[model samples]
Target chain A: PQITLWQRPLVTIKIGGQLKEALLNTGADDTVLEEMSLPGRWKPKMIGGIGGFIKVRQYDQILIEICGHKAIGTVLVGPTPVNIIGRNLLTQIGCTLNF
Target chain B: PQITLWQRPLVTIKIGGQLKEALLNTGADDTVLEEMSLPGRWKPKMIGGIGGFIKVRQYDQILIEICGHKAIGTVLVGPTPVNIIGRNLLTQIGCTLNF
Candidate 1:
C-alpha cells in the first residue's frame, strides 16, 4: 500500500496559570491537555474514543495565537506530552492540507 | 465544573508474528503504527502530531471481530502499546456515548 504523508505547522500554547509552550497537533480532532498542566479548580470530563474511555478535564480558554491568528478553544487539562490542535480549531483557522 | 469519565473495551492485537492484545484507544483519530511492528515490506508514512512528527506504517486490513461484529480496518504495524479505534471505525460501528 502507498503511504500518505501529511504536514502542518505546530502551534504552541500556554497552559495552567503559568505560561508554557505546548505543541499543537493539527491532525487531532479534539483538544488535548496534559493532565499535569491543569489548574486546581479545573474539572475533567470523561472522553470516550477508540482506545476506550479516558478522563479529560477542561481548562481555561486563553488567547491561543497561531501563525499570527488567534482563537479560543477548550484545552484538555492533563499531564500528557503535548496539546492536540484538532479539526475544531483547524477549520476555524482555515488551514490547508498537503499530501 | 465536573469531571466526566468514559470507558470502552481495550482490544488486544498481535504484531510481528506474535499475537498480543493491545489496548484500544477510542479517543485517537488516526491509526497509530508502532515503530517496531512493521514487517519488511511495510512502508511508514511521516505523521505530524501535536508534539512533533513521527513515522507510521500501515499493516494489513485484517478482520477485526469486535462485540460479535466484524469489520476490516487497517491496523498500524508497529511496536506501539495500543491500537486506536478512531472516529472512522466509530461511525462505521454506530457507537453510542454515555457522556
Candidate 2:
C-alpha cells in the first residue's frame, strides 16, 4: 500500500491488544506512544524532539501491528503529542519513502 | 526514488542558497528548520512536540528545494534538533509512504 502525504501519514496500529492511530515518522528514530500500561519491566529514558527533552519509559521487544503488518521493537511510552511509528518499527514492516 | 527506513531518511535540501540535510518527516505537520536568515517579515509562533512547545519565527512562502524538487510553503525557523521536511512540503513533491 502506498500512503500519500497530502495529510498526516497516520495509520491504525494494534499494540497491547488495543487499536490506536499512529503517525509514520521518518524523522523519529524510535517509536513513542502516549501513556499506556504494558506487561514488562521498562527503563527510564529521555527523548528529544523539536522542543526539548521528555522522560519516558522504554519497553523492549514489544509487538506492534501497523496496518496488519506485525513488527517487534522497542517502544517508548511517554507524553508525546501523538503516537509515532518511527524507523525502528517501520523497517520491520518494509516501509519506505517513495516519490 | 524510494528510500528505505533502515536508516534516517535524511536528504539534501537547498534553502536560502545553502545546502543542508533534512529528515523527511511524515508525522510532522509543518516544516521546521534550524536558525537561518530569510528575507521577509515573520510572526512569532509556537510549535509543540513530544516534550513541549518552542517559540519560532514563521516565514511564509519560503522556497525550498528538496533533492532538487522545488516547493514553496511556510517554514519555521528555531531551535530544532534536526531540520525536517514535513508533510506540507512532502505533498508538493508527491512524496508518499509505501510498503
Q: Which candidate has the highest TM-score of all?
A: 2
Q: How does model 1 do on interface RMSD, in angstroms?
A: 13.6
TM-score of predicted chain A against the true chain A, for each candidate: 0.59, 0.98
> Candidate 2, residues A1-99: lDDT per residue as tens digits?
999988788899999999999998888899999988889899999889877889999999999999999999999999998999999999999999996
Off by over 4 Å in 1: A1-9, A15-26, A36-41, B1-99
Q: What does DockQ come to for candidate 1?
A: 0.06
lDDT for residue B8 in candidate 2, whole number 0-100: 87
lDDT of each: 0.46, 0.91
| Model 2 lDDT on a 0 to 1 scale | 0.91
Top lDDT hit = 2
Error of 1 at A4 (Å): 12
What TM-score would candidate 2 get against the native? Answer: 0.97
